[PDB]
Amino acid sequence: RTLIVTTILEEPYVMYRKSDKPLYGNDRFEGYCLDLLKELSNILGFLYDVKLVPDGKYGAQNDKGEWNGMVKELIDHRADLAVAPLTITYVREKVIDFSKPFMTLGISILYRKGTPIDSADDLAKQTKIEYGAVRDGSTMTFFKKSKISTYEKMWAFMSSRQQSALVKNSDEGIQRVLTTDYALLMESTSIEYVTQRNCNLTQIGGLIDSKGYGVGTPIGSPYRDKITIAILQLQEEGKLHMMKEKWWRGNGCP
Amino acid sequence: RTLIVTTILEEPYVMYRKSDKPLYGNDRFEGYCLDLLKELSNILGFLYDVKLVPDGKYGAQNDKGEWNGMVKELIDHRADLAVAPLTITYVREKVIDFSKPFMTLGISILYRKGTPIDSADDLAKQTKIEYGAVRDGSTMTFFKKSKISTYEKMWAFMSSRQQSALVKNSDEGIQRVLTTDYALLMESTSIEYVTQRNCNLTQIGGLIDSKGYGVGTPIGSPYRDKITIAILQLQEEGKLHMMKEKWWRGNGC
Numbered sequence: 001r002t003l004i005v006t007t008i009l010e011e012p013y014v015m016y017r018k019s020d021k022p023l024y025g026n027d028r029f030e031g032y033c034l035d036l037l038k039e040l041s042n043i044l045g046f047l048y049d050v051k052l053v054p055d056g057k058y059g060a061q062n063d064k065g066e067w068n069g070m071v072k073e074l075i076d077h078r079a080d081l082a083v084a085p086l087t088i089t090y091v092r093e094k095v096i097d098f099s100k101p102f103m104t105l106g107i108s109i110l111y112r113k114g115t116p117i118d119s120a121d122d123l124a125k126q127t128k129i130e131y132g133a134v135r136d137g138s139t140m141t142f143f144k145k146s147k148i149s150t151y152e153k154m155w156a157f158m159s160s161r162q163q164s165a166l167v168k169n170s171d172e173g174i175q176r177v178l179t180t181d182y183a184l185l186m187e188s189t190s191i192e193y194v195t196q197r198n199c200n201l202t203q204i205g206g207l208i209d210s211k212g213y214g215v216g217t218p219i220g221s222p223y224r225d226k227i228t229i230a231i232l233q234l235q236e237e238g239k240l241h242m243m244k245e246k247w248w249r250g251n252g253c254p
Numbered sequence: 255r256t257l258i259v260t261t262i263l264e265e266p267y268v269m270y271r272k273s274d275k276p277l278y279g280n281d282r283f284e285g286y287c288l289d290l291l292k293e294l295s296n297i298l299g300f301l302y303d304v305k306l307v308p309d310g311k312y313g314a315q316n317d318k319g320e321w322n323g324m325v326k327e328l329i330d331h332r333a334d335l336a337v338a339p340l341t342i343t344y345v346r347e348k349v350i351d352f353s354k355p356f357m358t359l360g361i362s363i364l365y366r367k368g369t370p371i372d373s374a375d376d377l378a379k380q381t382k383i384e385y386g387a388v389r390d391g392s393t394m395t396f397f398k399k400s401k402i403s404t405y406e407k408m409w410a411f412m413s414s415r416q417q418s419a420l421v422k423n424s425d426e427g428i429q430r431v432l433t434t435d436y437a438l439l440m441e442s443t444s445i446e447y448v449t450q451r452n453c454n455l456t457q458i459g460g461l462i463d464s465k466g467y468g469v470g471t472p473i474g475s476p477y478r479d480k481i482t483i484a485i486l487q488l489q490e491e492g493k494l495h496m497m498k499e500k501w502w503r504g505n506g507c
């Protein structure tokens with residue numbers, strides 16, 4: 001049978017292809033995750049239909065504890081796999097079976113070049129420069145649930161004033177950084193994509209944590225380990241590396 | 255219920271404690287992997303006995319397809335867990351169940367400072383400088399099975415003259431790097447440890463690949479997913495980073 005793969009739009013993992021006519025099915029999309037999905041299907045030998053997550057969300061719980069986003073699609077068995085920049089977190093790993101990481105990364109800071117800010121501590125210990133993250137993503141959740149004093153403070157600043165320091169998505173966060181005196185807490189992978197294309201911005205400090213993106217499957221899924229094994233094979237052959245270079249490719253900056 | 259944990263001595267993951275009196279049981283060991291094991295037993299609430307792997311090996315296949323080392327202990331159900339610098343690889347993941355990486359790393363180069371050598375390619379195209387890796391480890395295997403031009407060539411060199419360029423273990427590799435004109439391809443985490451303690455040695459280039467160390471368990475183990483979830487919690491709390499900083503920090507160079 002055909003596997004239903006839930007995903008979400010986000011450059012450069014999943015994007016609408018460009019054509020002079022209307023596109024249909026899997027052909028509507030392209031990006032790192034589509035190349036990954038293609039490699040996985042060739043190795044494990046399965047057909048698949050890509051379907052954008054209806055509510056456009058990654059995955060979190062409501063006050064009742066019920067899930068949404070791609071996580072929910074897997075939990076309800078409306079999707080067999082979730083292929084996207086979906087962070088392997090403690091809370092999510094409890095409700096679905098993640099494959100092993102096909103990409104390793106961490107949270108970092110997106111800000112302007114030629115500045116004296118050099119770390120999260122610098123941001124936390126002042127108030128003139130605003131900073132935040134994408135609402136309901138694994139980055140905001142990191143700050144929300146953190147116990148490390150520096151990060152507890154930064155959270156206080158983020159959730160204050162009805163969370164006005166937070167943005168709805170990466171595109172909005174990036175524009176806010178570009179237009180105002182705002183710093184964006186975002187995953188290193190996405191920051192790298194930006195900095196390579198926009199020399200006016202840079203990453204501040206290093207990674208404040210370590211985590212990975214993994215293919216999601218429903219708990220008990222028989223595809224989880226098979227996918228984990230294909231991912232390890234792809235990494236060992238250098239394919240994951242080639243795929244990353246193919247999609248992050250930019251002129252670079254001085 | 256006391257779990258049996260197979261491991262292997264390797265600084266600073268698993269080391270004998272220093273005492274003037276004989277040590278017994280788990281008290282004989284100390285290191286990053288033992289602190290991790292303690293954190294894990296505390297979250298999951300299990301008891302455990304640390305036992306060094308009999309043949310002193312990590313885990314590889316021979317031509318008959320038979321496994322040895324820690325991997326074999328798990329396959330044979332002689333250990334409930336494998337906690338050590340055991341690399342999560344394609345061939346091993348097919349015979350045992352790895353938890354999720356509690357440490358991420360990659361293969362890099364250990365060599366002395368002050369030379370023109372800047373990458374693996376610099377080594378592969380030349381022949382005067384010798385280079386190799388610890389025999390039968392995941393690093394050597396990477397080169398042995400690689401189909402990438404540069405690495406294929408480096409393997410051709412490594413396996414030359416009856417593998418004279420390979421060493422039996424990390425300690426031997428380090429001494430060879432310190433004494434002769436030799437470079438040791440070895441996982442970055444170990445290189446970092448060495449360079450913190452040998453101001454004359456350094457890492458050449460970056461990581462040529464990406465992989466992690468995972469807690470090993472027999473296929474179908476009920477503890478694998480539980481360990482995974484505990485590890486993720488440890489990393490999100492910053493405890494894994496603290497543990498690394500604790501055992502890696504040298505004295506200054």
Ligand SMILES: N[C@@H](CC1=CCCCc2onc(O)c21)C(=O)O
Pocket residue numbers: 010058059085086087088133134136137138139140170185186187190
């Ligand atoms: N990967 C995050 C969401 C996310 C996606 C894309 C851009 C990078 C990023 O930075 N913070 C996030 O929440 C994100 C998640 O799994 O919630």
Ligand SMILES: N[C@@H](CC1=CCCCc2onc(O)c21)C(=O)O
Pocket residue numbers: 264312313339340341342387388390391392393394424439440441444
């Ligand atoms: N982790 C490797 C073995 C290993 C152990 C310790 C030192 C670092 C290293 O570099 N190459 C290896 O094979 C090693 C493995 O699991 O085979």
Ligand SMILES: [Cl-]
Pocket residue numbers: 065066067075
């Ligand atoms: Cl639910």
Ligand SMILES: [Cl-]
Pocket residue numbers: 098099100228352353354482
């Ligand atoms: Cl896993």
